[PDB]
Design a binder for this molecule. Sequence first.
Ligand code: XAT
Ligand code: BCR
Lengths: 150, 184, 202, 193, 209, 39
Amino acid sequence: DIAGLTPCSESKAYAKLEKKELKTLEKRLKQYEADSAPAVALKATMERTKARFANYAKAGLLCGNDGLPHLIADPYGHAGEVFIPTFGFLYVAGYIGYVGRQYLIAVKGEAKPTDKEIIIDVPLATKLAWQGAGWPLAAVQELQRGTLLE
Amino acid sequence: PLWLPGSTPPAHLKGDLPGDFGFDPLGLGANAESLKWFKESELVHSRWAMAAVAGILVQEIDVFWYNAGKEPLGPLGLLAVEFFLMHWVEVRRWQDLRKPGSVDQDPIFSQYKLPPHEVGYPGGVFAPFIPGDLAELKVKEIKNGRLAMLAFVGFVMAAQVTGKGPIAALQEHLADPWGTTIFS
Amino acid sequence: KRDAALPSWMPGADLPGYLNGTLPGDFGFDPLYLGQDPVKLKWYAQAELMNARFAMLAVAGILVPELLSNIGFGAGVAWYDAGKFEYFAPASSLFGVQMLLFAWVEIRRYQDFVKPGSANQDPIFTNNKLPDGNEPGYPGGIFDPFGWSIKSLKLKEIKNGRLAMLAFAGFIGQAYTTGTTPLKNLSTHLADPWSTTVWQND
Amino acid sequence: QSWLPGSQIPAHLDTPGNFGFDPLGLGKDPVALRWYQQAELIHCRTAMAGVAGILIPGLLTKAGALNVPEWYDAGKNSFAPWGSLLAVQLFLCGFVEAKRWQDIRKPGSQGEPGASLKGTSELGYPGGPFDPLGLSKWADWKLKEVKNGRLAMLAFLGFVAQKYATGAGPVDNLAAHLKDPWHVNYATNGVSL
Amino acid sequence: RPVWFPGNPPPAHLDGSLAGDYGFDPLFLGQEPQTLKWYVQAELVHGRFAMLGAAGIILTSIGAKVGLGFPEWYDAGKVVVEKNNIDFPTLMVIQFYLMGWAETKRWYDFKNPGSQADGSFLGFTEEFKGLENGYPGGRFFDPMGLSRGDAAKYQEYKQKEVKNGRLAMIACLGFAAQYAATGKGPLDNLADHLADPNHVNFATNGVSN
Amino acid sequence: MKDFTTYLSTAPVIATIWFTFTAGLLIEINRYFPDPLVF
Ligand SMILES: CC(/C=C/C=C(C)/C=C/[C@@]12O[C@]1(C)C[C@@H](O)CC2(C)C)=C\C=C\C=C(C)\C=C\C=C(C)\C=C\[C@@]12O[C@]1(C)C[C@@H](O)CC2(C)C
Ligand SMILES: CC1=C(/C=C/C(C)=C/C=C/C(C)=C\C=C\C=C(C)\C=C\C=C(C)\C=C\C2=C(C)CCCC2(C)C)C(C)(C)CCC1
């Protein structure tokens, strides 16, 4: 497939990485009874670890000659790997940043601003917190309006 | 004249109304709005109880008044002619409260009108014989009234305990007074 | 704030203002307050008449062909299963011609509603005109050829209309549940009325 | 007229669909509020339209009048390429939206002496050739237009989400519920929201 | 005036003006007067829900301990659910809508005295007035109009209401910490204690709790 | 308690009452949605 690398749903090495990890935990689980506490953990981990492999095979990631899932970072077979998450960040980071902007400016005009950086006006911040939900629509409109730059 | 002699009545009860014997432990009659309503429910309630306890006895002077539910025009056929007739009548009484005079005039035969009258005591048509005189009657009315109201709950708890009606439950009491109480 | 001395539906209650006893059949019923804005009373007042006169016609169209067909005279069917497929033209056309002839008459009537004297004269035989009524919904002339001149009369119209409009709602309702003609519903009710209410049948 | 009676409406709505809703305070900038009002207006008109061609088809199909597919499966069909259809559409709309955009910038702008009687009216309400019948004292129409709009905007988001969840027609979803309302819900499916 | 801890004077922020004011806020929680206006409603509602709940158990439980029909309050949710037609998720969601509505309106009366009063609803203007933070009254909340009766008669009930409130809140939590420590109904916890009270205590099984 | 709340609204206290929140949130989401390399 892309860069000649196999899909994880098919690839042998990936499916032999399944086996090795599981068959590490089944060599442990022998040393305990089935009713016991740690046996429920070494079964639950296995169940989870065997579920995990299944859920990349269903996701359809590209696995190499290594047996490990590699990622795709440009265009549309593998959007969700990077292209979607990427926006996730720029949003929540932009959220944090713009809330922080609206806080510092909102304090600025109040005799001594430095006190509000330490004894933070919580009920100011928690109102700006929610306001900062719709930030790109404000951020754009502020770049337009021309209050964004000194 | 007081429910508990030597008491002082509550402030709101002044012996104006008929059968005001200074009784409102929970200042129910405290607000004039509510006390105007409660006046009516206490008339009508007794009027229905007097009418009903009068019935229970005289219908059994027989079979269980309680299982009379089981009696020529189907159930839903009869519940209709009640509903519309009762809805008709009850609304018109309820307008006389909504505004004290609003209804008195025969919508058909508007020639005939019910003369100006105190609430819940309508008269005109409804006082043909103009019998015994002035308030005193309204004080028999609420007295005889309450006694009838009480007796009914009696008649009910009397059914729901003995199985028999009123006159049989009494005949049972006479037979063994010492034995046939609630305390046995 | 509300007329005192005119027809009420809850005697003792309050007509609201906008129902002056001006329009025909005002006893001042508008619980939801749909006639508030006097623009919207103008429409509804007319809307009522149209809807009224279609019902009163229709309900006669419904009942009579049963009243006669049971006495036994010559074509008589069910007022819903009637329009199925049994006519000299097809469904399609009979609508087309219907929609055409109306679209004309209605835009004529509508202009008269919009402007009170706009359409009162023939535009072909232009000496022919219906008189200066000045009363949309009550246009007159041809439309009053035997010449009943009255307030009396304009009540009797909307009272019959309100009653007919229902009767038709009933016909929809009654058919949809029971599944026979409304004179057959009234027959079975009259045979044993008590054991045949709605509540019985529901 | 308030959206939450008691909540102090934000100052920047002094009653110029205004029920006082702007919690995040997008439209505090009156630049942004004029721009955002026509976003709404366009969003309403399209959606009222679009939904009419999801419901009125979808309702008549059960009625039996029209053998229409479901709105998910009306895309897929042979006549022309979709590339073409989108292109020709993207071409044709792009022209006209650009005539809206210059109106939003320079209201009158669409009446240059040089085929333009489509000058304007007020902002977001172009009228004239967009108003054949011509309707103009009762501008209550202006109100319903936003309201019937926000109702329809929600309705579509509903369609999109309620096929993602049950995978069946809105005219079906409407019945399934109406058949057993208390066992067929929001609450008896895939995802809790 | 009477106090929670006789001798120890009550803290300034308590006047003897509010119902059940026994100079008790040892932790200075309700000091700022707004933050106490908030707690006097929490306490009322808590106590009103607790009273309905305590009356709610105290009747089912005798109903189950009078005739073998009614279920124990603990395992009486599933018994309502399973036996009858209904589902859990929807109830829980229906509830949240109605309670959501009911609360969200009380919600905007705390911050705004006479807010919902404006008739902005179903034309019901005078029924959703302020009156007194914690007692809304009118034709709905106080139908009989003890609210609009007499000055003293109503003042005494505020007193009765908060006290019953505080006793039901205790009562309720016992029900909840008594099923826990002994796994039985509150008229099995009460019958066992009346027959042999000296032995059937916590001392037996119910530990420090 | 005007004073006690100002202290609770001090920088080091808020940071900690904020981080235990956005930490839990991320531990929590990794429980019911375990092991993500997509979404
Ligand atoms: C929901 C929506 C908008 C939601 C936004 C909200 C809530 C805004 C609210 C707020 O901003 C305020 C006011 C104030 C802020 O402080 C807070 C928030 C809360 C942020 C728009 C949907 C808008 C919905 C639209 C436009 C959809 C239109 C439908 C079309 C055209 C689809 C086409 C087809 O369906 C047909 C017609 C036929 C089918 O066969 C085929 C296809 C092709 C699928
Ligand atoms: C897509 C993609 C890609 C690419 C990318 C690129 C190529 C980019 C570029 C970019 C660029 C070229 C950029 C630029 C920029 C500029 C500027 C100039 C900036 C600015 C900024 C600002 C101004 C900010 C602000 C703010 C906000 C908004 C919020 C927060 C706060 C603050 C203040 C910070 C890749 C392949 C990787 C991956 C996949 C996808």
